[PDB]
Design a protein around this ligand. Sequence first.
Ligand SMILES: *[C@@H]1O[C@H](CO)[C@@H](O[C@@H]2O[C@H](CO)[C@@H](O)[C@H](O)[C@H]2NC(C)=O)[C@H](O)[C@H]1NC(C)=O
Ligand code: NAG
Lengths: 161, 108, 112, 130
Amino acid sequence: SSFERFEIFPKESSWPNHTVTGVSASCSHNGKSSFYRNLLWLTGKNGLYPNLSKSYVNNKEKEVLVLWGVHHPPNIGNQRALYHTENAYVSVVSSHYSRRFTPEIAKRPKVRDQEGRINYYWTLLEPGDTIIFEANGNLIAPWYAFALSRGFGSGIITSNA
Amino acid sequence: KSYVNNKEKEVLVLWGVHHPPNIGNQRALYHTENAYVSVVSSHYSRRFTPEIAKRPKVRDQEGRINYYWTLLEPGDTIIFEANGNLIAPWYAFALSRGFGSGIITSNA
Amino acid sequence: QSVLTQPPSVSGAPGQRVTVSCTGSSSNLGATYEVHWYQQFPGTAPKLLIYGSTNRPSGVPERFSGSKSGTSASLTITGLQAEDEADYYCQSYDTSLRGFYVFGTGTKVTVL
Amino acid sequence: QVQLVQSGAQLRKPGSSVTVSCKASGDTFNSYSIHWVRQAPGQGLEWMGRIIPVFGMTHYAQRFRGRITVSADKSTRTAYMELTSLTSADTAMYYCARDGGDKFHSSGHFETNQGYFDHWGQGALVTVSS
Ligand SMILES: *[C@@H]1O[C@H](CO)[C@@H](O[C@@H]2O[C@H](CO)[C@@H](O)[C@H](O)[C@H]2NC(C)=O)[C@H](O)[C@H]1NC(C)=O
Ligand SMILES: *[C@@H]1O[C@H](CO)[C@@H](O)[C@H](O)[C@H]1NC(C)=O
């Protein structure tokens, strides 16, 4: 019925050793390159991509929807240019959620002028739990997350009315 | 290899991945111990890795071929990349759908 | 454009340590962009001195080192030599007005 | 090093336009951006705009939008900038510069919106007077 959009991992203080300013033409807005407002694309800094480790404790007393993604480059040159490694992994866990992702490098038909892909994943973090993000490359970090409050009688309709 | 769907119909593309019983067979046929198969389309994306294992014999084989498929939309492109263990599509089907049909099991 | 504030002049004796400041805002640096520095001599194009706030290009003396903190940045020149008299500029990226690159106002560094 | 090569000094009258070229020599014209930076005599540096020749995309500073056009033609490995409706206040040294913080790939477009001018042209002086 409602939710609060809150910043889970503040952009300016959560990643001092990564570049958090990445944009794409495919997400342009008003003529300039941009990116998702709730996600942050982390790339290396000063030639390095230091191992990441971040966590959030759900002190909102609501289920929290956490969104993130994994970048899958078109080639090796791009994988190394951005993450400085050929063997990146992304690992996301909570008390009950556990998933490890591995980037896949492949030539793909272009969609919206891109050959690579970003897969999107999500989970609902229960009140009092902790979500932990560990990675050495290819992570599109959550920036904003939603504290949800459920109601009754609602649904989704498709309409031009 | 790639194919562009210029048939103006959905195209059913079938392929498989070979999973040998052992290392000697993996090397005898593909000359590598680290093969992969990667199949993509604008919306389909899957990477396969062969698994080597001793299995009970079925039809006198210890290895297996897994079969996969996808429907390629009109105008799209399917790309196959591999360094071993690929059972390539040879034939594919351009489909035309209708109504009222179904599958029944019968000895009539 | 000329939005990163720099002192108009910095000075000290040869052999001394002096610094050139660069103050930005939230759109520049405060939006986590880095500071780059250039050394310009009269008659020529500026050349890169520092990049990424702290790194040097090959060929740049150890005398030059920079840093960034908060929304401010600086260039430190340690052990001023006569050849260091120059116009120094800071550069970053400003996210306002649909996005633009910015320069500071420039600093004249004088060896005394 | 990589050398950007600019046109020489030119004189233009108020109301006319000026074209300043920048050729890529030893560069391997490739997926990198070229930026235009202006410096009026006695002044500091001002960014005017940029082009990425492999995508054909440009971006301009708000002060020049409507007056500045940037284009490139890879067959001669050359970038061009044109500034229209010139006045005496536009007398300046016009420099081209190459970034090193971008390194674009010939696939899709991605930027970190950070960079530096790794290489500079010598500067084309443009004087505007009657
Ligand atoms: C948001 O929607 C608009 C359409 O309302 C998209 O604009 C189209 O983008 C394609 C890109 O392949 C162009 O070929 C079309 O010509 C554009 N149409 C119009 C009317 O401008 C826009 O790209 C969408 N954006 C984002 C950022 O997701
Ligand atoms: C960032 O790098 C510094 C070393 O330069 C290190 O001390 C610090 O712990 C690292 N960062 C974070 C965000 O934990």
